[PDB]
Amino acid sequence: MDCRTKANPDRTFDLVLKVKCEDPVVLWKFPEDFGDQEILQSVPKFCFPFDVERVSQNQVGQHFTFVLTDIESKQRFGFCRLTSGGTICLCILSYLPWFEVYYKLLNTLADYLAKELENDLNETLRSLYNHPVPKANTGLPTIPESRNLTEYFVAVDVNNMLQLYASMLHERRIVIISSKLSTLTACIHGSAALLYPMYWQHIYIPVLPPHLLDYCCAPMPYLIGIHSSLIERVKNKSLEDVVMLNVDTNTLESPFSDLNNLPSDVVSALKNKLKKQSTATGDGVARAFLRAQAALFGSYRDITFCEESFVKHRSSVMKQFLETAINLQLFKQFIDGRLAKLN
């Protein structure tokens, strides 16, 4: 009900593909008899979600993670290793949010391919594929260990972190733009995780490929990443009111003033902590946002939830915020989930 991760997926991963740029060509996949043709058609386009013709040669070697959303709104993570020059891409599709593991595994698969070690590769794939999903080694994201938060934090000004946070907490239509897919998907995953223990409940596309640009016209809330080579095409579409952050320049444009709606004491406490040298290592950043979440929604402690008791605070700024907070799908799923488990 609450989280958008599949609890107990059938497999550690479902597909691995090597793809090259008419559509991209699949050079090699495991399992060989992979049968979902819809995924075979879409996954290659998400491997190269940029104007290939124009910026292939600007692409630097990187790792990034697309997400495909299933019928239950659960996330299928596309862990990709894109080679410098952007012509070749290695991709593991999994329900498990194992960014650091799969990034390492992708490098190891790349090295096995270059050293022409086919058996060892098939062995490794097989063994992990048929391995029951392991629940033990057999917690808040920390910097620099968790790659999505770390890259978010190094790439995006503190002020813009605060602005994206506020925009999420008004369930705006958000577009994040970067010239780097690593930074792009990282910003989308890392920004969303800072809602904890709440999760983004609406349209969630870390990177949106060219053939799907029209989806930026969606009227419902959304969090969408676009490579910089596609932003002009998107802008020329007829959009709703949207919040855009261009990470290449740390330029935010929004017709709203959502950050002004958050209580100042919370914002300055969060801001002051984010600028503190020591916050930049270990769980400081996630803890800072965790503490902001507590201050904003903590009063929810008060079996059923009484909206009118929660919305009744003394300060006009906080009362105003709490009255909008009750209309957030992210808050609604959190409360409802917590009412379900309390029994």
Partner: protein, 169 residues
């Protein structure tokens, strides 16, 4: 085009929303790719060219209540339940209550889909009609499979939205 309108289709997965979206579209889904899909219908109502785009999203059934943020920018909603599933109806009542309380400016209609298997039906017509009645909204029972009452249903929401717009002007 003369006018453009934006619709949402809401309802539990397994009520036939995607079959309804196929009937809606001019042409011939991304719902299992990016959790969202839109279809385009063009129609002429009294000489006027109208383009309708309708939006669906995945896993809506996990929303006990779909909140007011979902409907911003939208002109009309098609709220769909499955006449063979009592749970799909109960949810739909909650959603239309939230709409009534927080988004009364949005046109909405109630739709009982899969009106195809009598032996499996559970939501009686008079029940839905009574709820429809007390929300001040119109109700259609349809079969996206057999293509029954579907065109009637689409032409209703389309007309509602066109009139709200001219009654605002």
């Amino acid at each position: 085009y003369d006018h453009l309108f934006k619709l949402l289709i809401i309802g539990d997965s397994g009520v036939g929303k995607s079959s309804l979206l196929l009937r809606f579209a001019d042409n011939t889904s991304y719902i299992t790719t990016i959790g969202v899909d839109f279809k385009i219908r063009t129609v002429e109502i009294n000489g006027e060219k109208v383009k309708l785009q309708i939006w669906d999203t995945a896993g809506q059934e996990r929303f006990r209540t779909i909140t007011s943020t979902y409907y911003r920018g939208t002109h009309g909603v098609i709220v769909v339940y499955d006449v063979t599933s009592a749970e799909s109806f109960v949810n739909v009542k909650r959603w239309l209550h939230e709409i009534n309380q927080n988004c009364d400016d949005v046109c909405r209609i109630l739709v009982g889909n899969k009106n195809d298997d009598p032996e499996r039906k559970v939501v009686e017509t008079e029940d839905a009609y009574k709820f429809a009645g007390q929300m001040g909204i119109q109700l259609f029972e349809t079969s996206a499979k057999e293509n029954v009452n579907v065109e009637e249903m689409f032409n209703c929401i389309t007309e509602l939205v066109l009139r709200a717009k001219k009654d605002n002007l």
